[PDB]
Design a binder for this molecule. Structure first.
Ligand SMILES: CC(C)[C@H](NC(=O)[C@H](C)NC(=O)OCc1ccccc1)C(=O)N[C@@H](Cc1ccccc1)[C@@H](O)[C@H](O)[C@H](Cc1ccccc1)NC(=O)[C@@H](NC(=O)[C@H](C)NC(=O)OCc1ccccc1)C(C)C
Ligand SMILES: O=C(O)c1ccc2ccccc2c1Br
Ligand SMILES: O=C(O)c1ccc2ccccc2c1Br
Ligand SMILES: [Br-]
Lengths: 99, 99
């Protein structure tokens, strides 16, 4: 689809057997989700944003569906107040910015 | 243009008579610039993200040119490590997400 930006670009995703809303975020290198269970023995990882760094869990090889486009990749899980879809997945589903 | 997302979407901008680069950020409601001087009245504001919170100076009616496209709006100035172009300005240049 084509998504204007008058509102937050929230879309529905499926991950870890759960339907969720997430923000399509061109300003995120990585994908960071609110607290949830995912399979795998995670590795620690640091990410930073406005306000500072947080240590999160990195899960590799995770399946995710973003508006029905399928993807597999690394997902981070930690204390983010909003589910964020980052560029690592955005490229996979062929998402571009256009003007 | 059409920007793919294998790298961060950093583009050339002009603001306050200065050439700078900024991130086109669909995950930001607001526009946030690295610490700089701007003339005129401003209000203290606070914004949230991943790291938690920062304090910023809010300026209204600021002109930024973004890849040759004018936008004018509210801009926040504070301790960000990257200049961020938010949705308030991205709409004005007709920027959309496409997949
Ligand atoms: C989501 C993160 C992975 C992302 N960070 C990154 O991509 C960084 C660069 N990458 C990274 O860390 O890579 C790992 C690494 C570490 C070390 C060395 C090398 C590599 C990020 O925070 N990106 C932000 C930009 C940034 C980057 C670095 C440093 C400072 C700022 C926004 O672009 C991004 O689009 C977020 C998305 C978001 C939305 C909502 C909540 C949290 C995050 N927006 C924002 O922070 C914006 N906030 C908003 O639009 C609003 C209004 N705030 C909000 O909703 O927050 C409420 C809140 C309050 C209190 C606590 C928590 C939340 C913003 C710039 C104004
Ligand atoms: O859980 C699902 O329904 C599901 C089913 C098949 C998938 C295939 C590829 C990526 C995600 C997938 C997801 Br998230
Ligand atoms: O980008 C330009 O076209 C331009 C051209 C000439 C300039 C001369 C002085 C300062 C900025 C300038 C800029 Br910002
Ligand atoms: Br304040």
């Amino acid at each position: 689809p084509q998504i204007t930006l008058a509102k937050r670009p929230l879309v529905t995703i499926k991950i870890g057997g759960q339907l969720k809303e997430a923000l399509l975020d061109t300003g995120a290198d990585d994908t960071v989700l609110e607290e949830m269970n995912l399979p795998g023995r995670w590795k620690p990882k640091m990410i930073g944003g406005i306000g500072g760094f947080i240590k999160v869990r990195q899960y590799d090889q995770i399946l995710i569906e973003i508006c029905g486009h399928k993807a597999i990749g690394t997902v981070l899980v930690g204390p983010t107040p909003v589910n964020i879809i980052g560029r690592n997945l955005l490229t996979q589903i062929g998402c571009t910015l256009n003007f």
